């Protein structure tokens, strides 16, 4: 609840006819913001209507989350222990700028020892990343692969997928 | 609602030793048979450690609870 | 021998280390070691199976 930064303000002057409902549509655009929101913050959108000298203002507020591109992980539901397993990871660049300084990390207890970070190419807007990773699961059970993507537009974008690693056939 | 994958890592090799070392700051060892007393003591101590060690504002990169516990208890990390 | 320590230092300088590996079988140790070998460009992916 701590106030981070003031991003956008907008003043309208309207005339409402008596006993008439009016709907005003306002576009909330990122490029209108006076500055980029700090990381891990949320958007407080407030409306305030004041008329003449009624000494009372209508007010409403809404908390808006900032939505980052979906990190899609494709991996078989079941995997054999001590056999190589391929997981493809895709991200669509839905921003207004290229994605630069791109680092992707993969980890998960029971599949990968500590973490392995890789660099993939810069992604131009409306293009897609499609990275494939090969690793051998070594522990039997219900495991989880965690993928983290870093760039100059966003950081610590994390998605996960669960894989059941089964014992080899006797 | 955004779900963030988290590695609790309670079965890491040093987490049990670190938890018992933290509990050892409580001198009512006779009460360690009681989960209520143990939970209260550890919650108070971990809140104290969080207030001592968490700094005012990568910096937001997280690898689960175990590195945070190690840094809170030892100052390294 | 002199050449023994010579080449041991030479391969240690670019060696692949897996420290505190949570493994309990030779197959798992070998698989993780070969994965880290590929990661550090020590071996090509076509050599991993052999």
């Amino acid at each position: 609840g701590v106030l981070a930064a003031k991003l956008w303000r907008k003043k309208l002057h309207l005339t409402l006819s008596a006993n008439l409902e009016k709907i005003i549509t306002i576009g909330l655009f990122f490029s209108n913001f006076e500055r980029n929101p700090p990381e891990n913050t949320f958007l407080r959108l407030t409306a305030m209507a004041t008329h003449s000298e009624s000494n009372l203002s209508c007010f409403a507020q809404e908390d808006i989350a900032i939505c980052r591109p979906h990190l899609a992980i494709k991996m078989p539901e079941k995997a054999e222990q001590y056999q190589p397993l391929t997981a493809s990871v895709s991200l669509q660049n839905s921003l207004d700028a290229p994605m630069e300084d791109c680092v992707i990390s993969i980890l998960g207890r029971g599949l990968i020892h500590r973490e392995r970070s890789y660099r993939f190419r810069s992604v131009w807007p409306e293009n897609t990343m499609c990275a494939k990773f090969q690793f051998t699961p070594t522990h039997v059970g219900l495991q989880r692969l965690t993928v983290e993507v870093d760039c100059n537009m966003f950081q610590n974008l994390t998605n996960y997928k669960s894989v059941t690693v089964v014992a080899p056939e006797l | 609602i955004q779900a963030e994958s988290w590695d609790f890592g309670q079965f890491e090799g040093d987490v049990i030793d670190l938890s018992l070392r933290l509990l050892s700051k409580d001198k009512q060892v006779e009460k360690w048979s009681q989960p209520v007393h143990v939970a209260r003591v550890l919650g108070a101590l971990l809140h104290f450690l969080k207030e001592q060690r968490v700094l005012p504002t990568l910096l937001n990169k997280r690898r689960g609870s175990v590195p945070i516990l190690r840094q809170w208890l030892t100052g390294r990390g | 021998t002199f050449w023994s320590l010579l080449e041991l230092r030479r391969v240690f300088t670019k060696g692949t280390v897996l420290l505190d590996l949570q493994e309990t079988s030779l197959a798992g140790v070998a698989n993780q070691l070969l994965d880290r070998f590929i990661f550090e460009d020590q071996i090509r992916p076509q050599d991993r199976e052999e």
Partner: peptide
């Protein structure tokens, strides 16, 4: 997939796996 991602030697989270056990 299509990408052949190149390894990135990073030690930003290296200390996150340093155990406290002597």
């Amino acid at each position: 997939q299509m990408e052949e991602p190149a390894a990135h030697d990073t030690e930003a989270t290296a200390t996150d796996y340093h155990t406290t056990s002597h």
